[PDB]
Amino acid sequence: YXYXYXYXK
Amino acid sequence: YXYXYXYXK
């Protein structure tokens, strides 16, 4: 939980 | 910009 997939671009 | 790759899990 932190980096990875979900938010960003 | 919003959803995608960067933050999450």
Resolution (A): 1.4
Q: How many CB atoms lie within 10 A of CB A3?
A: 11
Closest Cα in chain A, distance from residue B1 (Å) = 5
**Between A and B, how many residue pairs show a Cβ–Cβ distance under 8 A?**
37
Cβ-contact B6, A2 below 8 angstroms = no
Q: Which of A6, A8, A9 sits opposite B9 (nearest CB)?
A: A6
Dist CA B1 CA A3 (whole Å): 16
- PDB experimental method: X-ray
Question: At which residue do the structure tokens 């990875």 appear?
Answer: A4
Cβ-contact B2, A2 below 8 angstroms = no
Cβ-contact B3, A5 below 8 angstroms = no
3-state secondary structure B1-9: CEEEEEEEC
Dist CA B5 CA A2 (whole Å): 11
Contacts of B7 (CB under 8 A, 6+ apart): A2, A3, A4, A6, A7, A8
Closest Cα in chain A, distance from residue B5 (Å) = 5
Measured CA distances, A4 to B2, B3 (Å): 13, 11
